[PDB]
Design a protein around this ligand. Structure first.
Ligand SMILES: CCCCCCCC/C=C\CCCCCCCC(=O)O[C@@H](COC(=O)CCCCCCCCCCCCCCC)COP(=O)([O-])OCC[N+](C)(C)C
Ligand SMILES: CCCCCCCC/C=C\CCCCCCCC(=O)O[C@@H](COC(=O)CCCCCCCCCCCCCCC)COP(=O)([O-])OCC[N+](C)(C)C
Ligand SMILES: [Zn+2]
Ligand SMILES: [Zn+2]
Lengths: 678, 678
């Protein structure tokens, strides 16, 4: 007959084909209080052809499972768990009902000829409901999923569920579901409703109160039987003995914290706008107290078009990804910094888009500065001011305009990328900064070799080639050492050939015989100069540039960075700064000066590039690995509770590029001299 | 006690909190024979607070459910099904075991104070195993899922499961799983393992024998409680009365057919290569019996670069999509013609990539033809042949090279698209054919207005603008009639302005005053000509072109095609053919002839364009709707058991573009006259 049974009592028994064991559990749920029941069954018996069958009957629901619980892994590997445990979906007592009397039946059965042994334990969860800002520690398992209840407070309108574990394995899933039964807490149904994240050691889910009827939800923790989805293997979690006993226990700590208010949004947007409008204010003001004592059109049409063919396939995509899985609840599509990702409307990380405002604002400010210089210059030729026709270097502002437009387009492209960062998207974070870098290095060349220009397509088919190399080296050459040696050879030889041909010899000429000329340069210690040469300054700087590029390629060879786009960005930034330094050193070697404005811009360039590169090396997310592996890297916001390290990288890279543009524009202003230069 | 019960007998009973009803079912499974058992329970009782709980205990497994079965839809709509039915996962008897004796228990329980009424029926499935090429008809339901067994024959190495229904609703899921228990046949777990497709009225899953241990699988059919995933609404399947009785019965027919052999692959690849190598053979042979009686370099670098910035974001993607969900089994990501989609390696539809071979081969053949013409011409100026300097129209082959390169790039881009067609990808099927079309129309202009050329970026920022319009009109203007009227206004006014300025008036000049000049042209019947004018031929053709474009825009206005990329392609093809016809008619109006080669090329152009456009209107898949809605359109292969209508569109569009290139190249050959032309 029925066995009136007690909570928190361990019942041991034996069940064969003849005898089936019933247990009755009676309990009362009081209003304004939620009681969850947890059933544990373990079975020392190990005969997988006669498992123990457990049935839990409630008033409105039935649950059933086998002990041992069997899982099937990839490559036909099978696991069995002798301890199974489940929380029964609770019906919460309200004032409509009063004290609810609840009955629960537990059937244990088996078809074994001689019965199977089992232990049963039914408990009431003392801590089923999670509290705001209180950290809760618990343990889960592939055969013992967990879930807890959270009720939104009356003033909180949005929360973040932050889940932390100290070990990466076992791979896990954190799901948020509504409180209507049933709860989907099994491996095969957690990803059906609600919003979920795969997790190794970090998860962070942002929830709005308006998405949940009753202002409540369940947080479900389901441990996976293998680690393939998290970047591991069949069994890379070593906990226990491999003798008829298997557990993948995971220690978890969950904290549900309220999100930032709209005051933080307002304050951060105001800060982001005003720090870069202070640039406009300072520039105009200092220029107007200093005042107190077109062939370039096509250039615009050059970059914008290249931007369009570059910027449209990414927009099309993020619009899709920001939606086509937003409604799905799968938060493994976009690789956000989920610990600093503040939503606004349909944007899941509005701070990552807002931090790109500096690129646009400073690109426009530089366009205004170049426009004023172009206007004053073109005006000075109209009055035939002799200081404009036969004094100083001939000016061609057509490439500074491209610099400013490219800065703005970099802001736009990186914002579009940060709408949803993933693997089909990565280059749009920093690839246009190659173009910018190129446009600067070219401007370093044409500032003293002015009558050399091919700005139709060879100036941008180079960008196409660089993008091809970067993308196909990320996709097809992840760390394959046969790719890295080939690319290092290309890097070293390009660096030597082009540096000996363009920097040395001063010619923009791209033959096959550059190598021959690169033999003609220095294999001449017994032809041209001694170890105490005459025009050594160019040769030492050539050797130093080649040494820097060789060291860079060597570090890339040993360390083999999987993020090859950031590595290419490092190549370009390093070479830009190196040849800018070489130009300044050559200016100082001559009798030329460095006026106060370019001097301040040089110091600001160095400082901003150091700071920007510090914040660039803070890895807060990935796309190389799995979403859980990238979530391992997430960090809280570092500035104003709104911006993380990558946002500061955006700000400071915009500022550093702006000041490098200013150096390029204002370096040669000391040449108010009639043209007798080299 | 236990009730020894019979199969195919209907047991009616009442279960309250006190009485629980058990039924025992005993049966033998013979070796080399699979027996599946199906349990049906219905409950006339309708008190959703005291459902009937059904437990089915087998030796190695337990199953349980409620009657009525409750489903929760979107927007908090709830459904209840009073008839539930399930097939128990069978353990198949082999020669290791012999005749297996199997026992099955069915528990019916309820906590109702006065019991609930129920009917129980347990049957043996007569047709659990599906046979090759035999169609099997059955019925499924959201509360009565079905699944069947298929064993691969000893010689078949790959099959296609083709599922057909005559009505689109209810929305359904067809899943393929391995035969190891349990079977995931519920709404919340079908998409966990195996490969699945959502289906309204057509599904087609291709399976390799090597993916399945034991050469067996289960085909699972699960009906969804709503139609949202298939493009419907909460309840758009009207079958039954809405009085306490709910069924979403779906009639299904499944056929498992063997796939084509590798002989078909070989024969189809040989055909695809040889039909287009016959072009090379015929061209070279006829040219060599007829023989029996560089400024253009940059042009190359123009298109390739534009191709790169266009072709790389799509490759990056398909590589991802061809994999990132290939291993997931979700076949709702790529919108193939699943009834003609033949795999080769990692490509799921190798025929769609192979059919793009004609573009590459014919683009190369045209490049060779233009190269030979360029060589003979440049040679004729070196000998100062007077027929090359003062005879005929001045020649500039720099744009024919772009035509050939663009044809090759269209082949490449459409292949990359067909690696995985979906919504983030669509333009790459036909968008580059805009460029080609443009490059042809421009060549129609410069053939008589030669000293007008701006081929730096305005010739391709137009392509960028057209791509922007197309993509943002697909994404943000699906059928929104406020988008279609705006685009129709733009189309009509662009067609009138540019046709009156470029075709009429012969000027490539883009001011705001074109409209004024378009008032100056014809609002002059009382200024220039009577109704019997002098140079009417240009005016009638102008009016006819504007009428054709207006009719096109009007049809687009009423019918509002959701595939706007194909609509833009129609605009471009129509205008190309229209102005080519106008050029030929003007040639005939003058004393000029049409030599035999351009005459044959004109006839071939017309014929190939008619055939290609017929095969273009065969809609075999979509990306506008859901994957099930696009699968409604799938068709079997029409040619060689390998190619469908879209593959023939690829072939014939390559041929039609090739012959239009030939018309453009060879039309003006009758001008062996000294230059006294208009
Ligand atoms: C006189 C004038 C002086 C002026 C000099 C001015 C020159 C300017 C100098 C420096 C500017 C360079 C910026 C570096 C940016 C590289 C980024 C990168 O590669 O990412 C990879 C790291 O990289 C590696 O693992 C090793 C490769 C880096 C080589 C280091 C340069 C040293 C070479 C020369 C030194 C030898 C000296 C030569 C001997 C003569 C990946 O790492 P990550 O953590 O995944 O990347 C983070 C980004 N992401 C996080 C968001 C993923
Ligand atoms: C001989 C040379 C000189 C003449 C040259 C002219 C020849 C050149 C003519 C045509 C060249 C191109 C042919 C049409 C291509 C349209 C494509 C299209 O829009 O698809 C849409 C159909 O769209 C519609 O159903 C309505 C729009 C079509 C308008 C028809 C033009 C009539 C105008 C003139 C008549 C009145 C003129 C009055 C005279 C004063 C979408 O439908 P679909 O089925 O999804 O598309 C299938 C594609 N896909 C399936 C694979 C998805
Ligand atoms: Zn960024
Ligand atoms: Zn196609």
């Amino acid at each position: 007959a029925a066995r009136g049974a007690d909570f928190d009592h361990v019942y041991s028994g034996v069940v064969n084909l003849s005898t089936e064991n019933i247990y009755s559990f009676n309990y009362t749920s009081q209003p304004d209080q939620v009681t969850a029941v947890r059933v544990y069954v373990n079975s020392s018996s190990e005969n997988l052809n006669y498992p123990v069958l457990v049935v839990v009957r409630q008033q409105k629901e039935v649950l059933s499972w086998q002990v041992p619980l069997l899982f099937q892994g990839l490559y036909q590997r099978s696991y069995n768990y002798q301890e199974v445990s489940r929380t029964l979906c609770p019906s919460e007592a309200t004032n409509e009902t009063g004290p609810l009397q609840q009955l629960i039946f537990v059937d244990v059965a088996s078809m074994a000829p001689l019965g199977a042994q089992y232990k049963l334990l039914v408990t009431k969860l003392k801590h089923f409901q999670l509290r705001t800002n209180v950290a809760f520690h618990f343990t889960a398992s592939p055969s013992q999923p967990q879930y807890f209840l959270y009720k939104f407070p009356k003033d909180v309108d949005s929360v973040i569920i932050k889940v932390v574990s100290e070990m990466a394995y076992p791979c896990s899933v954190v799901s948020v579901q509504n409180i209507m039964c049933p709860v989907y807490d099994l491996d095969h149904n957690v990803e059906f409703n609600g919003v979920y994240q795969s997790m190794t050691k970090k998860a962070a889910i942002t929830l709005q109160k308006k998405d949940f009827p009753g202002e409540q939800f369940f947080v479900v923790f389901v441990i996976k039987p293998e680690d393939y989805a998290c970047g591991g293997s069949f069994f890379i979690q070593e906990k226990e003995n491999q003798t008829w006993n298997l557990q993948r226990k995971k220690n978890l700590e969950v904290t549900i914290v309220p999100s930032i208010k709209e005051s933080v949004y307002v304050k951060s947007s105001l800060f982001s706008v005003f720090i870069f409008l202070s640039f406009y204010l300072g520039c105009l003001l200092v220029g107007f107290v200093h005042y107190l004592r077109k062939k370039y059109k096509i250039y615009f049409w050059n970059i914008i078009t290249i931007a369009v063919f570059y910027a449209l396939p990414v927009i099309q995509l993020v619009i899709t990804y920001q939606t086509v899985v937003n409604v799905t609840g799968n938060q493994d599509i976009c690789y956000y910094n989920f610990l600093c990702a503040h939503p606004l409307g349909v944007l899941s990380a509005f701070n990552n888009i807002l931090s790109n405002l500096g690129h646009v604002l400073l690109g426009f400010l530089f366009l205004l500065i170049v426009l004023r210089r172009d206007i004053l210059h073109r005006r000075a030729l109209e009055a035939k001011d002799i200081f404009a026709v036969e004094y100083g270097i001939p000016k061609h502002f057509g490439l500074f305009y491209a610099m400013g437009i490219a800065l703005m387009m970099q802001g736009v492209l990186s914002a579009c990328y940060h709408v949803c960062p993933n693997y089909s998207n990565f280059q749009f974070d920093t690839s246009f900064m190659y173009m910018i870098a190129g446009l600067c290095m070219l401007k370093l060349y044409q500032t003293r070799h002015p009558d050399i220009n091919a700005s139709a397509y060879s100036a941008y088919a180079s960008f196409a080639v660089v993008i091809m190399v970067t993308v196909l080296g990320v996709v097809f050459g992840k760390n394959d050492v046969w790719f890295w040696v080939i690319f290092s050879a290309i890097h070293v030889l390009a660096s030597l050939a082009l540096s000996t041909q363009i920097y040395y010899m001063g010619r923009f000429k791209i033959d096959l015989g550059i190598f021959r000329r690169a033999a003609m340069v220095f294999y001449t210690d017994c032809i041209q100069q001694c170890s105490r040469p005459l025009y050594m300054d160019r040769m030492v700087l050539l050797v130093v540039g080649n040494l820097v590029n060789w060291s860079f390629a060597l570090f890339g060879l040993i360390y083999r960075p999987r993020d090859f786009a950031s590595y290419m960005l490092g190549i370009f930034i390093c070479n830009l700064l190196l040849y800018l330094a070489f130009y300044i050193i050559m200016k100082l070697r001559s009798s030329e000066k460095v006026l106060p404005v370019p001097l301040f811009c040089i110091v600001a360039t160095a400082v901003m590039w150091a700071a920007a590169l510090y914040f660039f090396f803070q890895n807060l997310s990935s796309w190389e690995g799995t979403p859980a592996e990238s979530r391992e890297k997430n960090r809280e916001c570092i500035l104003l509770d709104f911006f993380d390290d990558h946002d500061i990288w955006h700000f400071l890279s915009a500022t550093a590029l702006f000041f490098s543009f200013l150096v390029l524009l204002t370096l040669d202003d000391d040449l108010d001299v009639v043209r007798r230069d080299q």
